[PDB]
Design a protein around this ligand. Structure first.
Ligand SMILES: *[C@@H]1O[C@H](CO)[C@@H](O[C@@H]2O[C@H](CO)[C@@H](O[C@@H]3O[C@H](CO)[C@@H](O)[C@H](O)[C@@H]3O)[C@H](O)[C@H]2NC(C)=O)[C@H](O)[C@H]1NC(C)=O
Ligand SMILES: *[C@@H]1O[C@H](CO)[C@@H](O[C@@H]2O[C@H](CO)[C@@H](O[C@@H]3O[C@H](CO)[C@@H](O)[C@H](O)[C@@H]3O)[C@H](O)[C@H]2NC(C)=O)[C@H](O)[C@H]1NC(C)=O
Ligand SMILES: *[C@@H]1O[C@H](CO)[C@@H](O[C@@H]2O[C@H](CO)[C@@H](O[C@@H]3O[C@H](CO)[C@@H](O)[C@H](O)[C@@H]3O)[C@H](O)[C@H]2NC(C)=O)[C@H](O)[C@H]1NC(C)=O
Ligand SMILES: *[C@@H]1O[C@H](CO)[C@@H](O)[C@H](O)[C@H]1NC(C)=O
Ligand SMILES: *[C@@H]1O[C@H](CO)[C@@H](O)[C@H](O)[C@H]1NC(C)=O
Ligand SMILES: *[C@@H]1O[C@H](CO)[C@@H](O)[C@H](O)[C@H]1NC(C)=O
Ligand SMILES: *[C@@H]1O[C@H](CO)[C@@H](O)[C@H](O)[C@H]1NC(C)=O
Ligand SMILES: *[C@@H]1O[C@H](CO)[C@@H](O)[C@H](O)[C@H]1NC(C)=O
Ligand SMILES: *[C@@H]1O[C@H](CO)[C@@H](O)[C@H](O)[C@H]1NC(C)=O
Lengths: 444, 444, 444
């Protein structure tokens, strides 16, 4: 059951520690989602880089909805009539649905269609807003993150004909600063010093993100769509329809802004017919479309969520990330690193350009384990020139079936082509080649 | 007095230089704010990574203020009266306080409150703007930076029972490109080659920043608050009230924009009472709040200033940054690296979540020096599981009292918990544990 | 003709591969635009890091123009006249130049200049838009990139008194993830494993970019200027004048927005004289200025283009970038690395602060090759303190004349100063010093 992970083929650098006036270190690079194994001269010590996370501080929060809008207008032929005035309809709310918010607009200087030729009619409206399908979202401002690696340390013994887990701990290490060090084992003999070369290869930009909220205010996967900061009131972007301290929704500064967004005009004054539109985005009917979550659209994002109910940090878990630098240090004793052979029976897949322009090789490896080297060819011919080389990693100790996404450079354009896969150290004779089809989704 | 810094425990890699058809290098990683020491086989050579700076080019500048606003309105009952017209009050400045700027607005189609029932009154206003407390700020657009490390090289001799500084130079090295090399010592025997793994762990985003300015235009610590670029005229953001080539302030395109931002309505025409507001942000009274400087709110920022009076570059000094890669190269001779022991008597502190959502351990170490390894526990019990491990560095050669900020991952939530500190290489018996209290400031 | 590149002086680290239960690697850092050479113990194997590219996915596209604008207005003295009404001129297009787009505006409540004192005139306009000089541009939204290094591998034999190229291949390697490996030579004996320390030192921010388009929709060098996203309709930014599925240009939501951007007022009603302006940016006459391409203004950008006619990815080629980490691995045999001597006859140049605040040393080296170490001095005196040290690389095997841009830190302010250059390993006696002039272009 509990077994060592695939032990990765790793070059080891022996570094000598500086002298104390009154010591060898084993240095190596470790890949995200991979493990490195060693014995101390007996337990098999394994270190797996399990996670790469950005912890973004949340500097603003507000709750918003998507309004369902209806405008009800009345026309008056006589400009001097007590019905329809700037008093009652210019910069004022409708007089007192409990969930509705209602703002008034005034349109004098209308054309006398349905009136006398000497009349200058006036149109007066109530612009009603209700939350569409009672949807609620939390808007958050995310700022520059702190970075953390999660390592899983596990020591194994092979007794009674099976591997047995002798010790297991999760280790957390901040990556933005200098070398971070601590004891690895329960006996405190081995230490793990973690050094990042620099900032994680990917990062979510500073700005506005959002999550759908439940009745209890429970959040989910973060989404990105043009969204107002707390101090912004741009009607082309999300967040102009906000919930107050009570669960009541309002058009942000609606009393004053209504005359800027509500566009209306008389068709026939007597018939009480008129033209009316909202000059804004993100409302119902017909002006709202919800983006899919960040994790669905970004191959590099495994997850992007708000950490807990205190709503202080958002955590982005990376599916892709550069290697970390490790230094293993310690009676007189020697460390020996071990790796497992890599293997592959077959593969299948396709070359994809998705609706967001991600150019990927969607790959499934069969009965595979460890380091798999791949070559993308110029055409369908297995002997045609190589235009791209990559390496995929399968962390399972035993031959497993696994699906993965391999980013592809732009040179890998339209059309079917050959892709050849080969397990690390295997001869060219043991490569697997297949003609792989191309599928391009239009930009949506 | 002038003494070597704490010599950091450093793993050294011996690299062999490629052959010239017609040479050993000492390689190591160096942490920001730390020093590495060596002897050449006698002077004690010390290299300290003193600074990490981003030099951002300034691509736009303009001077702005915070206006103090007052609207003075007059009402006229008779729509055809020569008093209050589109001629005199629509898209025009007030006729000619020397520092004031005055823009006019026109509101016809008013309700006859205080007039006859057949009247259609008109309201006319003067909207006056003055600089609040004569405050001046420089808006700057900062673009992608160039990166520089500052090293302090200092060679020491121990004669007459004391250390004496034999040589000292400041060394500057660009980090964005390839390996940068130069001679270290006065005798030109030792060379320092600096290689960054990649871009500095933190960076100030491209965009608009600002500084308060004095009478002489002297700048200070940079601040970040939504602010218009030179070509933008968004009234929800700072910078719409700009100073011209003379020290005169104007509402940017005020003559044309006034009718969009000034919202007014008659209360009683005869009584000369009316409602009036400005639909904009960042003005007085009651619509202005100044953000604290970037250095105060961002733990990673030690300083963010405009370099000099030419106003061409902004310099961001980093409080946190990844390690740099060093190669020391050179008659036949050998380099020996030395380190000092690490020590700690005690510590105090608290776990803090500030008003900007920075999750930190505010730490004070007592009589400490060198490398200090810390463990954050699951609960108040000193033997409860470790949820986070970190390392702090104290660069003082002698036991010193120092305060520092340690970023914490989100798993370190609410509540008091134990934190244990231990100097590098000390036995578990020499660790110091304390129950540390939690304090969370609400989001402001 | 076809000759090896300059073989760079490189420190080599020998790493030992982990053991397989059933192997030495040669590790080194390689600089962008440089080459490393070795022999296997005979062919001279050369690896050149030729390119660093970001492949940005394009998530939005739209075609836009720069409108040439003309407003034609008519005044009517009598407010009740059938000529000039809200019906015909408020929120409507002009009635049906084939390329023109025409939107109407209505301005009642005018002052009776040229009318009777009891008249309340009305102004009616046609606001016409045509594409200025038939210019077309493609707006693109660029998102976070994938990173690729291009290596040129070339093996040389020296027979018949000349170098002869025995093999040459271009190698592509993704940098965002883990170690990428493949065979280097035709015989598959040597392998090249590429590891990036982290994300490329520079990156183009997520956002809106544009390119001029030809008749066939052919793109060119990308430019950056405030530009609307597809869902934005901000008149202070580019892209509000868009081309539809036919080659026809429209003011985005022009029918509704016209009353917000067209500002007009009667001068004399009878004379048919009036004031008229567009409250917007990026139109002709007098309100349009085109930024120079990204590659021209950013020293770090060699090129920034749309890859091909499918318009799915934009490719940014970097002129500056950090080193990559290489591991060369393989019968029992040994790898020996070789380098060429560095040389320089003379140099010329100037210190420049351009119109975009880039602080650079514009340098020309004469009869130079390899590694050139430079020192920037405090004053004009050749013996004055060094305020900055840098290293430039010339990849040509033979002494060549080459121009380059060296970024300078802000400490290198105004005024003439000495700069001293010296080829790697040359004695201080062989340095070349010149007093170098300062030229600062004002901020434009
Ligand atoms: C992956 O690599 C590790 C080495 O890094 C392999 O570990 C080896 O596991 C075998 C058992 O599978 C151990 O062999 C011996 O087993 C007999 C009982 O059959 C026992 O009497 C011996 O004392 C011994 O334990 C061997 O010690 C162990 N090697 C090391 C260096 O730890 C592992 O088998 C590899 N896994 C796969 C799936 O290839
Ligand atoms: C930090 O580490 C350095 C070594 O890296 C220590 O330097 C050592 O300093 C002592 C003096 O404190 C030197 O010892 C000797 O002093 C006597 C006079 O008392 C003199 O006659 C001898 O010739 C000799 O200089 C010693 O040479 C020096 N060691 C090295 C390798 O440089 C330093 O003491 C440490 N500092 C602290 C505060 O622990
Ligand atoms: C740059 O460095 C390389 C070494 O890394 C130099 O390569 C050397 O090239 C010479 C020829 O220029 C080779 O020498 C010999 O030439 C004679 C014929 O004149 C021939 O009979 C010998 O068998 C031999 O090839 C030498 O082997 C080669 N060295 C290596 C190690 O490859 C190159 O000359 C340098 N270039 C410059 C411009 O300095
Ligand atoms: C949910 O929507 C319904 C109408 O569909 C409404 O009656 C109800 O009050 C809304 N829920 C809340 C919590 O307001
Ligand atoms: C990749 O292919 C698998 C089938 O092997 C499919 O289930 C999966 O959804 C595909 N993923 C993408 C991103 O195309
Ligand atoms: C400063 O403010 C005062 C009023 O408080 C004003 O009289 C003075 O002119 C202002 N200073 C300048 C330099 O304009
Ligand atoms: C940290 O604690 C010290 C007292 O030891 C205090 O002076 C300092 O202001 C605190 N800093 C922060 C950021 O909380
Ligand atoms: C180009 O501009 C001319 C006027 O200068 C116009 O006649 C022509 O129709 C425009 N070209 C296209 C393709 O519309
Ligand atoms: C640098 O100087 C050369 C002349 O040696 C000139 O042709 C080139 O345009 C200059 N480049 C810059 C960016 O100033």
């Amino acid at each position: 059951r509990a077994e060592p992970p695939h032990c990765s083929k790793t070059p080891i650098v022996r570094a000598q520690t500086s002298q104390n006036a009154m010591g060898m270190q084993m240095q190596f690079s470790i890949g995200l989602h991979t493990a490195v194994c060693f014995r101390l001269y007996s337990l098999l010590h394994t270190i797996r880089l399990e996670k790469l996370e950005h912890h973004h501080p949340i500097t603003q929060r507000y709750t918003f909805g998507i309004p369902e809008v209806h405008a009800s207008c009345i026309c008056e032929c006589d400009a001097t009539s007590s019905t329809c005035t700037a008093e009652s309809h210019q910069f004022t709310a409708c007089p007192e649905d409990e969930t509705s918010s209602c703002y008034r607009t005034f349109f004098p200087n209308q054309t006398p269609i349905g009136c006398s030729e000497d009349d200058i009619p006036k149109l007066c409206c109530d612009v009603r807003f209700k939350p569409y399908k009672n949807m609620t979202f939390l808007a958050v401002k995310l700022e520059q993150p702190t970075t953390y690696a999660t390592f899983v340390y596990a020591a194994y013994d092979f007794v009674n004909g099976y591997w047995v887990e002798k010790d297991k701990t999760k280790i957390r290490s901040q990556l933005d600063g200098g070398t971070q060090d601590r004891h690895l084992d329960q006996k405190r003999r081995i230490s793990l010093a973690v050094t990042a070369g620099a900032r994680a290869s990917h990062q979510l930009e500073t700005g506005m993100y959002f999550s759908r909220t439940s009745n209890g205010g429970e959040t989910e996967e973060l989404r990105m769509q043009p969204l107002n900061e707390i101090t912004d009131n741009n009607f082309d972007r999300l967040g102009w329809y906000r919930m107050d301290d009570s669960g009541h929704f309002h058009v942000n500064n609606g009393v004053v802004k209504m005359e800027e967004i509500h566009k209306a005009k008389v068709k026939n004054c007597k018939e009480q017919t008129y033209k009316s539109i909202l000059s804004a985005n993100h409302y119902m009917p017909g002006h709202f479309n919800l983006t899919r979550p960040l994790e669905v659209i970004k191959p590099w994002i495994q997850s992007a969520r708000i950490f807990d109910s205190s709503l202080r940090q958002a955590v982005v878990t990376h599916a892709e990330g550069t290697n970390l630098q490790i230094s293993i240090h310690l009676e007189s004793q020697n460390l020996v690193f071990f790796h497992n052979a890599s293997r592959i029976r077959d593969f299948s897949g396709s070359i994809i350009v998705d609706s967001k322009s991600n150019r990927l090789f969607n790959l499934t490896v069969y009965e595979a384990s460890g380091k798999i080297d791949g070559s993308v060819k110029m055409s369908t011919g297995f002997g045609s020139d190589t235009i791209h080389t990559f390496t995929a990693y399968v962390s399972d100790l035993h031959a497993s079936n696994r699906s993965m996404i391999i980013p592809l450079p732009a040179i890998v354009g339209q059309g079917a082509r050959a892709i050849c896969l080969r397990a690390d150290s295997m001869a060219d004779i043991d490569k697997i080649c297949h003609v792989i089809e191309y599928f391009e989704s239009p930009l949506f």
